[PDB]
Curated annotation (Swiss-Prot):
Segment polarity transcription factor that provides positional cues for the development of head and thoracic segments. Forms a protein concentration gradient that patterns the anterior-posterior axis during embryogenesis and promotes the expression of anterior gap genes, such as hunchback (hb), ocelliless (oc), and buttonhead (btd). Binds to regulatory DNA sequences containing a 5'-TAATCC-3' sequence motif. Also binds RNA. Interacts with Bin1 to repress transcription of bicoid target genes in the anterior tip of the embryo; a process known as retraction. Residues 59-68 have a biased composition (Basic and acidic residues). The chain holds residues 97 to 163 of 494 of the full protein. It comes from Drosophila melanogaster (Fruit fly). This is Homeotic protein bicoid. It is found in: Nucleus.
Length: 68
DNA sequence: GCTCTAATCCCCG
DNA sequence: CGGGGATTAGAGC
């Protein structure tokens, strides 16, 4: 990683990220360009957030597995 | 340095 | 090409 954490989030980036996510729950170039302009963050951080969001979701649900 | 955890390097499909 | 499993490495305490 030659220079990780070239960015640091806040509640305002999570507020954008989540509200433009709702309109396209998977990334593409257009989803990623549009969020990059609005958050005022690189297109690489948008990917890295969508990825981190799925991991946080499915981690917390696996810790709450059930059975029948 | 431990801790927080978003970011990093290889794989899945 | 992004999801993403498992681990690395910078921001904060």
């Amino acid at each position: 990683g030659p220079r990780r954490t070239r960015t640091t989030f806040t509640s305002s980036q999570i507020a954008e990220l989540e509200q433009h996510f709702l309109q396209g729950r998977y990334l593409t170039a257009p989803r990623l360009a549009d969020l990059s302009a609005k958050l005022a963050l690189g297109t690489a951080q948008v990917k890295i957030w969508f990825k981190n969001r799925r991991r946080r979701h499915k981690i917390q649900s696996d810790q709450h597995k059930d059975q029948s």
